[PDB]
Symmetry: C3
Subunit: 133 residues, 3 copies
């Protein structure tokens, strides 16, 4: 292959932070970079190249069955390993992320058309609310 | 109901940062997330769950009426309270944000196809230009 | 003109970091904001304004012809001047970036299905893979 015409969506990206530490790129910018995924747009006429690099934030997938213990690696937040276990309490999904931080977990439940999430760690409680699309 | 299937768009997020500090998440990451809105995709079959979760940069709304003060809380920037007043000067919105920073305000005007915005704080001026599409 | 209705997409943004320095914005937030492009949707009629400001990550453009030296201001990364050259080698675009960092450059090619990118600085490599859409 010698022609690249099209829009290319990135699927893998290794040692990005290593490359940037080799460029002495500062730590805040690096924490930005490692959460991004790229899609480059490339048009070629002969040896002539037009390319544009585009970003958007990385997506994060947590899969589980209720009642089955599983290892979660908490990328997207604190990058810790935890034994996550999800259970029903009424119609409220309750997960406990057993591990290094005490009293760490989250509850989730639907009321009317809205989703309700409580994320807990120690003393602290974050309360989020969602609308269905 | 124990059916969580669908796409759920966040609309409220209290104490995200308390939750993140309690996980000992570094300052820069705490500043990245905090500007984000979150839409969670959930595919549930009985007790089997897949969640995909996506993040976008949070929107920032300012609505005002000219010649009447209003309360700007400068999220997306410095997180300060200011009392803003937008007056006319010919066809130029001129706004002063009384508050802590002396000589803080902005100016906004249309010149043909383009919108011009000069943001001022003390000795520093930032000039932005927007094409109408 | 006194009418501002429309969606306006940013095109230029000078002294943004200076304005943010005057406002005492913490370093990480500055390093985030300076990487953004903004679109303002404005709704008017009268003196009653409704503005929604939205942000996305700024694109980063690199245009060249295979063989012609060109200066790069590595804006998306370490903010450095390099003199870049891109050559064919077989079916593989081979760019070198002469400048302050030894062994800086990248290699880019397609393997039927997918696009392959390899950035090198010093002895460090970053390896990326894109699927065509
Ligand atoms: Zn985005
Ligand atoms: Zn929100
Ligand atoms: Zn920092
Ligand atoms: Zn960011
Ligand atoms: Zn971001
Ligand atoms: Zn972002």
């Amino acid at each position: 292959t010698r022609d690249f015409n099209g829009t290319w969506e990135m699927e893998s990206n290794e040692n990005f932070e290593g490359y940037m530490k080799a460029l002495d790129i500062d730590f805040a910018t690096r924490k930005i970079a490692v959460r991004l995924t790229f899609t480059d747009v490339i048009d070629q006429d002969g040896d002539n190249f037009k390319t544009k690099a585009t970003s958007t934030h990385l997506n994060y997938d947590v899969d589980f069955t209720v009642g089955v213990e599983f290892d979660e690696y908490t990328k997207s937040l604190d990058n810790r390993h935890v034994k996550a276990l999800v259970t029903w309490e009424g119609d409220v999904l309750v997960c406990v992320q057993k591990g290094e931080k005490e009293n760490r977990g989250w509850k989730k439940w639907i009321e009317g058309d809205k989703l309700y999430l409580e994320l807990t760690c120690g003393d602290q409680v974050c309360r989020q609310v969602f609308k269905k699309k």
